[PDB]
Amino acid sequence: LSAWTNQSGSTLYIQSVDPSGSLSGYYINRAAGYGCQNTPYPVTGWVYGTAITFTVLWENATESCNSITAWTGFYYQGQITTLWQLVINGSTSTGQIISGEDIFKPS
Amino acid sequence: LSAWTNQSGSTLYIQSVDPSGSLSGYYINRAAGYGCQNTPYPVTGWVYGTAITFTVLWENATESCNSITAWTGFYYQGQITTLWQLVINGSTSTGQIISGEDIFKPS
Ligand SMILES: O=C(O)CCCC[C@@H]1SC[C@@H]2NC(=O)N[C@@H]21
């Protein structure tokens, strides 16, 4: 399996990419100031050539953060460049969706 | 068993949400000016309370658009409000990602 670590120290663990492009994996968040660190969270998404999307549900056996992240990005020159959006359960405005950029490199 | 149509007339068909919150279904794009109209594309994502992510691979046996869209949003007052990001195979810049807002009502 295929591990990718971003600038914050978080790691995407890719367990499979189906011939359909269906991606399955887990994620360990290590980003300072966020909840749900150091423990595995499930990943689903798509790979289409060098394009990728993947999303993480922030609940597991031990810690919940009432939120989901979706990454949209692309593989080029040894890195996956992504834009992410994080939505909190019970939100009432797109104003409350949090966003940023993660760069992932092989680890 | 759960269909949602946006302001552009596109429809998200949620076929199942697992107890894990894993979403599966298909999507029929009817958004003027885009490719991959009128035929079902596959959906994966997560539901967490009122929070939802889903992502469509724009590949099927009928037409392919070499792209992926990821939606991030929430259910509120009977509609799903979403921000989306569309990435194209072979992209080299975050500048080439396209973004928008979709609002879905039950259909
Ligand atoms: O705090 C939460 O609501 C759960 C953890 C969120 C981690 C975010 S997801 C986008 C960014 N990328 C990371 O590697 N960590 C943060």
Ligand SMILES: O=C(O)CCCC[C@@H]1SC[C@@H]2NC(=O)N[C@@H]21
């Ligand atoms: O044109 C492509 O690259 C394939 C289809 C993209 C359709 C987009 S996804 C975001 C927006 N919401 C829709 O209902 N359709 C467009």
Ligand code: NA
């Ligand atoms: Na790949």
